[PDB]
Design an enzyme around this catalytic site. Structure first.
Site, PDB file in Angstrom:
ATOM      1  N   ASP A   1     214.919  26.121  -5.410  1.00 15.30           N
ATOM      2  CA  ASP A   1     216.353  26.449  -5.713  1.00 15.30           C
ATOM      3  C   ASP A   1     216.918  25.428  -6.699  1.00 15.30           C
ATOM      4  OD1 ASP A   1     216.127  28.634  -3.996  1.00 15.30           O
ATOM      5  OD2 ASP A   1     217.710  27.881  -2.660  1.00 15.30           O
TER       6      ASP A   1
ATOM      7  N   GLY B   1     218.895  38.935 -10.152  1.00  9.66           N
ATOM      8  CA  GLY B   1     219.576  39.748  -9.195  1.00  9.66           C
ATOM      9  C   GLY B   1     219.428  41.224  -9.466  1.00  9.66           C
TER      10      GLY B   1
ATOM     11  N   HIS C   1     211.924  31.467 -10.467  1.00  3.62           N
ATOM     12  CA  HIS C   1     212.406  31.290  -9.114  1.00  3.62           C
ATOM     13  C   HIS C   1     211.690  32.316  -8.133  1.00  3.62           C
ATOM     14  CE1 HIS C   1     216.269  31.064  -6.478  1.00  3.62           C
ATOM     15  NE2 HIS C   1     215.420  30.106  -6.154  1.00  3.62           N
ATOM     16  N   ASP C   2     211.566  33.588  -8.550  1.00  3.67           N
ATOM     17  CA  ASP C   2     210.850  34.608  -7.707  1.00  3.67           C
ATOM     18  C   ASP C   2     209.378  34.120  -7.463  1.00  3.67           C
ATOM     19  OD1 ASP C   2     213.089  36.213  -7.880  1.00  3.67           O
ATOM     20  OD2 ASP C   2     212.198  37.741  -9.253  1.00  3.67           O
TER      21      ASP C   2
END
Length: 118
Positions: free
Chosen positions: A92, A30, A48-49
């Site tokens: 996810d 984040g 995840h990115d």
């Protein structure tokens, strides 16, 4: 979508922390999205990115795709239908399982990203 990702995190960690604790952690969770991850937990976000980057190459819009998943007694599961929904749910689900398993170092919440993330 990102709200479901939040729900996945809460499901995986049995509401131990708000999903928000994972939106200011290290260099990737984040925060800036670059540099050496500060630990394996941060690296979950980096991965995840990269998963979302692939989803975009597939023609998906991962932050916007709404998928179907289940918060079970013993873990979470995806049960999605379109190609994009399956893939994004999978990105996810892997990130939420990763974040739930890695060690959460409170000193790595709200770090100096200017100094640590080049």
């Amino acid at each position: 979508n990102l709200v479901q990702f939040g729900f996945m995190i809460e499901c995986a960690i049995r509401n131990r922390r708000p999903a928000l604790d994972f939106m200011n952690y290290g260099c990737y969770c984040g925060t800036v999205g670059r540099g050496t991850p500060v630990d394996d937990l941060d690296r979950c976000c980096q991965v995840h990115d990269e998963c979302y980057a692939t989803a975009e190459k597939h023609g998906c819009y991962p932050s916007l795709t709404t998928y179907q998943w289940e918060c079970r007694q013993v873990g979470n599961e995806c049960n999605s239908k379109t190609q994009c929904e399956v893939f994004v749910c999978a990105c996810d689900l892997a990130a939420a399982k990763c974040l739930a398993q890695e060690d959460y170092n409170p000193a790595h919440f709200n770090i100096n990203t200017g100094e640590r993330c080049k």
